[PDB]
């Protein structure tokens, strides 16, 4: 994978050769931070992998350390980027 | 080259996805849908067959699931380089609705849309020893994890 951004010291990555996700960033920053409030220490993600963008749909996959990777989850936002900030 | 096959077949795989929909104002043939929780379990057998069961909960305003769909699946699977090529053979849906928010036709549509995403081929990325990521051509993705 390749980096997109970092939020609360969690690396937000995206696939190699992925489209431009920079138009989502404020929504990504917010949805990572609002997730961290429930997930401290050992529950905190070691990365988030973003995908989507095309067709007004963003996907964030939360990766926890492999000791507790049963907490791994996909959050999908079905909102245009202007709406997406209000969803989180 | 079957490295990827050893990973998929060695384990049963599980996932959760929450879909949050504030573009709900753009589709009333889905109805008052605000949120969707999907929990899934899948095994890929060395046969070249898989089986999958998914629990879909639909939410309106209630932090209560207005409607639950159980979708059970069976099919063929194959690999080509990093791509997992699925081929569904049967999709069974059984529904439960404890609410007047959702109509039969809206649950049927949402069942058809989960059937449309289940049919698609997906790039497999190994995230760690317990974790894989599936990515579709439409750039949608899901993270799967395994217990033991």
Residue numbers in the entry:
A (entry chain A): 206 to 293
B (entry chain B): 26 to 173
Quoted passage from the original study:
ToxR is a transmembrane transcription factor involved in the regulation of numerous genes, not only virulence associated, and can function as an activator, co-activator and repressor.
ToxRSp crystal structure was determined by molecular replacement using an AlphaFold model as template. ToxRp in the complex has an αß fold which is formed by an α-helix flanked by an anti-parallel hairpin and a three-stranded anti-parallel ß-sheet, followed by a C-terminal helix. ToxSp forms a lipocalin-like fold consisting of an eight-stranded ß-barrel stabilized by intermolecular H-bond network and flanked by two α-helices located at the openings of the barrel. The residue Arg281 located in ToxRp ß5 forms an intermolecular salt bridge with Asp142 of ToxSp α2, which restricts the opening of the barrel. When bound to ToxSp, the unstructured region of the C-terminus of ToxRp performs a disorder to order transition, by forming two additional structural elements: short α helix 2 and ß strand 5. The ToxRS complex exposes a bile binding pocket inside ToxS lipocalin-like barrel that is only properly built via stabilization by newly formed structural elements of ToxR.
